[PDB]
Amino acid sequence: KRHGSWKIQLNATSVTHKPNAIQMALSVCEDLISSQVYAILVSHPPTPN
């Protein structure tokens, strides 16, 4: 909004919990890297472990 009408755009892609640990990033490596992401944000302050 405050950066005007530059040709770049911003798209969001978020996923949810997985109980198993390898299948956390197993989805990430073919979802977000295929989406050409620049930054990944992890925001989970409750964990069962």
Partner 1 sequence: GILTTAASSMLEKFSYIPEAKASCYGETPLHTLHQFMVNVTWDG
Ligand X SMILES: *[C@@H]1O[C@H](CO)[C@@H](O[C@@H]2O[C@H](CO)[C@@H](O)[C@H](O)[C@H]2NC(C)=O)[C@H](O)[C@H]1NC(C)=O
Select 13 or 24, whichever has its Cβ closest to ligand X: 13
Is residue 5 within 8 Å of 21, Cβ to Cβ? no
Alpha helices for 1-49 (secondary structure H): 22-31
Residue whose C-beta lies closest to ligand X: 11
> Would you count residue 29 as binding partner 1 (CB under 8 A)?
no
Select 36 or 47, whichever has its Cβ closest to ligand X: 36
> Would you count residue 11 as binding ligand X (CB under 6 A)?
yes
> Would you count residue 20 as binding partner 1 (CB under 8 A)?
yes
Residue 4 φ/ψ region, left for φ over 0, alpha for ψ in the -120 to 50 degree band, beta for the rest: left
